[PDB]
């Protein structure tokens, strides 16, 4: 068996791509936006840092960490590697939807309404994060230092807006004229 903390590898290498960071700084990033879409078990961060140091991908000189030439190459090779799209992530709500025949019209409406309200609230939170990001002076573009953050946030916003619209569509079907 391989070590599950290896899921943090490219998250850590990527965080160091623009220059040196302390362990505190790295840990802080996992508690901010990165934790929203690439969650760490916080006990796994320092061990994985140590592994990547010992593998020669990172060096340290508070300890301050940077990428080595080997680490930059490891990051690069991963970034440009083409992979098949992965298997669909299990959404327990969607399994319930598959078995909707076991619910009455009202029970189905209540199930989907609960999900809609929760997804709208998540969407609200993401929109808050988006407005914080966009409160920067420099306009957004490919060349912006914040473009990567913009990509993960817009992706999330679109994803949740689409989920909300789909739930609305289904509630309208449950509530057919």
Ligand X SMILES: O=C(O)/C=C/c1ccc(O)cc1
**Site of interaction with its own copies (CB under 8 A):** 7, 10-11, 14, 17-18, 34, 36-39, 75-76, 78-80, 82-103, 105, 107-108, 110-111, 114-115, 118-119, 122, 141-142, 145, 147-149, 151-152, 154-156, 158-159, 162, 165-166, 169-170, 173-174, 176
Of 5, 7, 10, 33, the residue at the interface with ligand X (CB under 6 A) is 33
DSSP assignment of 136-147 equals SSSPPSTTSTTH
- Residue placing its CB nearer to ligand X in the complex, 15 or 52: 15
State the angle between helix axes of 23-31 and 45-54 in degrees (0 to 180), rounded to the nearest 10. Answer: 130
Q: Choose, by CB under 6 A, the member of 15, 153, 167, 174 that binds ligand X.
A: 153
51 binds, among ligand X, its own copies, none (CB under 5 to 8 A by kind): none
Q: Which positions from 85 through 104 interact with ligand X, judged by CB under 6 A?
A: 88
The contacts of residue 31 (CB under 8 Å, 6+ apart) are 42
CA 121 to chain centre: 17
Q: Could you give the dihedral angle defined by the CA atoms of residues 12, 14, 16 and 18, in that order, rounded to the nearest 10 degrees?
A: -170
Q: From the list ligand X, its own copies, none, pick the one residue 98 interacts with, judged by a Cβ distance below 5 to 8 Å according to partner type.
A: its own copies
- 58-60 and 21-22: which strand pairing? unpaired
Answer for the pair 30, 145: CB distance below 8 angstroms, yes or no.
no
**Footprint of ligand X on this chain (CB under 6 A)?**
33, 36-37, 88, 126, 129, 152-153, 156
């Amino acid at each position: 068996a391989k070590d599950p903390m290896r899921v943090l590898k490219y998250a850590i290498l990527g965080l160091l791509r623009k220059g040196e960071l302390s362990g505190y700084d790295i840990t802080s990033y996992f508690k901010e936006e990165l934790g929203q879409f690439w969650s760490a078990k916080h006990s796994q961060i320092y061990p994985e840092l140590k592994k990547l140091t010992d593998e020669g991908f990172i060096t340290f000189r508070k300890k301050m960490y940077t990428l080595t030439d080997s680490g930059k190459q490891e990051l690069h090779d991963w970034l440009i590697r083409h992979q098949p799209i992965p298997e669909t992530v299990k959404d327990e709500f969607m399994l319930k939807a598959y078995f909707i025949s076991s619910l009455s019209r009202q029970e189905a409406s209540d199930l989907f309404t609960d999900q809609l309200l929760k997804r709208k609230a998540k969407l609200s939170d993401l929109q808050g994060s988006y407005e914080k990001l966009m409160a920067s002076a420099e306009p957004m573009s490919f060349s912006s230092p914040d473009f990567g953050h913009y990509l993960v946030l817009t992706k999330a916003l679109e994803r949740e807006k689409n989920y909300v619209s789909w739930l609305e569509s289904i509630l309208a079907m449950i509530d057919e004229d």
